[PDB]
């Protein structure tokens, strides 16, 4: 599995597709594309435990987390596989994503193939808030668009 | 082996209720969770039928996953506009290399048999077209010719399938059903055929009894039929 891809949408103007690209099973992830309909500013951005979109929050459960870590920042040594941060809005409400990240996959123990990508109103604190709910979920206000992950190629 | 959902008086009164059906090997029963295993050779419409009981997901990890499947082209015949949910696929894993589908369809447009098949990519960006080959084909049909629920001129229809194919072969590709226009001529995209499909999603597959589906809201838009 070498390719993988989402379509993000939701209620409102928030849409985008984000590509996912690794070309070796324990080489990074490429991970880029465009959201757009987003305010201005820095926007959470990660990946749940499941991909089931029939009820909500409560059916793709939390950040994806087969390690059983706490919530942080991609760059963290301490975060769940799903934290991929934040993504950052322009002007014009545009977020080009373009990220690397060497915790998720596309195969094996970490792979987000399935699961539902998510971007959210507020930033992620990277668990560096001064709250419990921090180290779980970084704060990142209401979810404004998902998707789930699907094999591209 | 396929876990069912469902006080304690309430627990012989479906003990009860399926009792004289044949190719029953056990039943174990959790009314804590209000669920219910059933090992067997026998048919989960069988067992959903005698009794109000939907297919539940086990506790087995990577067994369990759902399809919410919509339109993506705009269809004249297609004036429901609140939501383009379409059906539901919930899948179970319910052997080594057996699964089970409930697929459930409502507030399509007209009346038919509609054609299930899982394609080979979960890329939805460009609808049907951008899902690849056919990478299953599930021979039998989803009789949609019941009158829905959300209104006249629409149908439903439910059906349960299977693939011999674990579960975690599907993740990620796309589930598709579609039927051909009955009016391809009135369709000004040059699209021959009414599709609505979804990635298929891992799931917890601790799903309610009724099957519906909400948005990003919480706000219920969509059901199957009653
Ligand atoms: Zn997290
Ligand atoms: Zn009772």
């Avoid at chain 1, 014009?92 to 094996?108: K, M, N, T, W, Y």
């Avoid at chain 2, 499947?69 to 290399?97: M, S």
């Avoid at chain 2, 001529?185 to 298929?200: A, C, Q, R, T």
């Amino acid at each position: 599995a070498t390719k993988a891809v989402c379509v993000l949408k939701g209620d409102g103007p928030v849409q985008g597709i984000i590509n996912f690209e690794q070309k070796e099973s324990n080489g990074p992830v490429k991970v880029w594309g465009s959201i757009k309909g987003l305010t201005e500013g820095l926007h959470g951005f990660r990946v749940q435990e499941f991909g089931d979109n029939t009820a909500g929050c409560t059916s793709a459960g939390p950040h994806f987390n087969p390690l059983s870590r706490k919530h942080g920042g991609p760059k963290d040594e301490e975060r769940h596989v799903g934290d991929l941060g934040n993504v950052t809005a322009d002007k014009d409400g545009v977020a080009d994503v373009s990220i690397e990240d060497s915790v998720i996959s596309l195969s094996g123990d970490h792979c987000i193939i399935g699961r539902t990508l998510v971007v959210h109103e507020k930033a992620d604190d990277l668990g560096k808030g001064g709250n419990e709910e921090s180290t779980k979920t970084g704060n990142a206000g209401s979810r404004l668009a998902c998707g789930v992950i699907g094999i591209a190629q | 082996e396929a876990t069912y959902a469902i006080c304690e008086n309430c627990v012989n009164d479906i003990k009860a209720c399926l009792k004289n059906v044949p190719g029953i090997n056990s039943l174990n029963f959790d009314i804590e969770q209000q669920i219910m295993s059933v090992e067997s050779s026998v048919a989960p419409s069988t067992i959903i039928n005698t009794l109000d009981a939907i297919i539940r997901g086990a506790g087995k990890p990577n067994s369990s996953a759902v399809a919410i499947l919509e339109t993506f082209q705009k269809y004249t015949i297609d004036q429901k506009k609140d939501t383009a949910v379409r059906g539901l696929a919930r899948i179970v894993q319910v052997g080594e290399n057996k699964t089970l589908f409930d697929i459930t369809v409502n507030g399509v447009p007209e009346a038919g048999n509609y054609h299930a098949s899982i394609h080979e990519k979960g890329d939805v960006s460009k609808g049907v077209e951008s899902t690849g080959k056919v990478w299953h084909k599930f021979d039998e049909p989803i009789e949609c010719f019941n009158e829905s629920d959300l209104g006249k001129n629409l149908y439903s229809g439910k059906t349960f399938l299977s693939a011999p194919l674990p579960t975690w072969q599907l993740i990620g590709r796309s589930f598709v059903i579609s039927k051909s226009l009955n009016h391809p001529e009135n369709e000004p995209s040059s699209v021959k055929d009414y599709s609505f499909l979804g990635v298929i999603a891992r799931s917890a597959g601790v799903w309610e009894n009724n099957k519906q589906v909400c948005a990003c809201t919480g706000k219920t838009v969509w059901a199957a039929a009653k």
